[PDB]
Amino acid sequence: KSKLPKPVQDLIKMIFDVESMKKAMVEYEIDLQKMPLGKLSKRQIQAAYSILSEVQQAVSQGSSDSQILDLSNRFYTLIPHDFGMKKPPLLNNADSVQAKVEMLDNLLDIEVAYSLLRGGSDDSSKDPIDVNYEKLKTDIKVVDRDSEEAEIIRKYVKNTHATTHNAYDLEVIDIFKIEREGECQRYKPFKQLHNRRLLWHGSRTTNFAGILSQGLRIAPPEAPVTGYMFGKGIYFADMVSKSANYCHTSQGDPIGLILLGEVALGNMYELKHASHISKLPKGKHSVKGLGKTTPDPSANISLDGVDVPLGTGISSGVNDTSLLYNEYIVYDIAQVNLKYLLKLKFNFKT
Ligand SMILES: O=c1[nH]c(=O)n(CCCCN2CC=C(c3ccccc3)CC2)c2cccc(F)c12
């Protein structure tokens, strides 16, 4: 087998884990002995993103009441749900509309995972951890633990474990450093941008087969602008936990992968409520959703010209808002580059 460090091999295994993939599919409500995860077409996946949008011209301009439901079963025709039986959410509603635009986000990254594990390995004369790892086009060094740099990480995780969702508690198992090919280069533009940060990205595990081969991405050319709080960028927290709930770690799979990304923020569009932008106005390089908890400015490490806000959860002064923690959003893919991965046990509670 691979000379690959054992944390790496094992990490390959969990992100290329097909069973898992259906697990998540079922967690949306998918009917898999209707539509199986060989069939998941990027084809169908984007044809239904468009159906989510037409339902929001519709619902946001009053509309033919009956068509709203036609658009709804159109949707359901296209993505089989094991409903199974209750009564299905008929898409007159901004709420279940993004409920479903989250699902499709995941089927995207899941199709990238699933289609990925049918390229190269019928081998053998390279082996199975080995083939998956190369098709990541990424290099995954094991960060060495008792060293200062793993400790800054864990200090980050620590101080930014939130003030409210302190039930689970967190714990770090492996610190992977990461290089995807070429994204040093594409990021070069933003290399010297002002105002530049280490922030968090949690995702389900079943997504990181696709985050490693494509980086984080902006949403499809068809995905509702209205499906995302801040329209169609890429999303980051400073608080470890605002991101860490996004992996969807239960008691029956409490291991989570979180990213650390360097992100070229510049001048932040400050915003307390939602804002369905496509478009960032001139003079503005990022958005900042304003939270009532910031990490403590009294603590703000800056290594390599990037800031790192490993600061305990302090009240900002901002009560006026729909967000409890900050978020950051960028509208160009190159405006971020991935630095670390973390393997995390979500250690639940009593
Ligand atoms: O760490 C975080 N991770 C997240 O997942 N979200 C939720 C928002 C994600 C919105 N998406 C944008 C569209 C996606 C996509 C998927 C595949 C292909 C193209 C786009 C994926 C995800 C976050 C939201 C706020 C603060 C955060 F820290 C996160």
DSSP class per residue in 313-335: EEE-S--SSSEEE-EEEESSGGG
Residue 214 CA: which ligand 1 atom is closest? 18
Would you state the structure tokens that stand for residue 221, as one six-digit string? 């050319």
Q: Is 19 a catalytic residue?
A: no
Helix, strand, coil % over all residues of the chain, rounded to 5: 40, 20, 40
| Pocket (CB within 6 angstroms of ligand 1) | 105, 108-109, 200-203, 217, 219, 228, 235-237, 242-243, 246, 327
Q: Are residues 148 and 128 in the same domain?
A: no
Contact 140, 11 (CB under 8 A): yes
Nearest to 293 by CA among 196, 202, 159, 200: 159
DSSP 237: B
Q: Are residues 124 and 1 in the same domain?
A: yes
Q: Are residues 152 and 275 in the same domain?
A: yes
How determined? X-ray
Q: Are residues 93 and 148 in the same domain?
A: no
Q: How far apart are CA 27 and CA 157, in angstroms?
A: 27
Q: Are residues 270 and 337 in the same domain?
A: yes
Q: How far apart are CA 200 and CA 313, in angstroms?
A: 15
Q: Are residues 93 and 175 in the same domain?
A: no
Contact 328, 262 (CB under 8 A): no
Residues 6+ apart with CB under 8 A from 53: 222, 223, 224, 226
Nearest to 289 by CA among 240, 242, 229: 229
Mutate-to-test residue for ligand 1 from 111, 235, 325, highest number of ligand atoms within 8 A of CB: 235
Q: Which domain holds residue 102?
A: 1-136
Contact 73, 239 (CB under 8 A): no
**Angle between helices 18-28 and 94-116 in degrees, nearest 10:** 170
Q: Which residue has the tokens 């790192």?
A: 308
Catalytic-labelled residue, pool 29, 183, 262, 327? 327
Q: How far apart are CA 334 and CA 336, in angstroms?
A: 5
Q: Are residues 262 and 170 in the same domain?
A: yes
Strand 313-315: give its sheet, edge to edge. Answer: 313-315, 291-295, 323-325
Contact 132, 115 (CB under 8 A): no
Secondary structure class of 202 (helix, strand, coil)? strand
Q: How far apart are CA 202 and CA 188, in angstroms?
A: 24
Mutate-to-test residue for ligand 1 from 243, 247, 287, highest number of ligand atoms within 8 A of CB: 243
Nearest to 138 by CA among 198, 182, 201, 189: 182
Question: 37 alpha carbon to ligand 1 midpoint, in Å?
Answer: 22
Q: How far apart are CA 217 and CA 334, in angstroms?
A: 9
Q: Are residues 330 and 188 in the same domain?
A: yes
Question: How many domains is the chain built from?
Answer: 2
Q: Are residues 165 and 209 in the same domain?
A: yes
Annotated binding-site members for NAD(+): 201-203, 210, 217, 243
**Angle between helices 42-60 and 94-116 in degrees, nearest 10:** 170
Q: Are residues 165 and 252 in the same domain?
A: yes
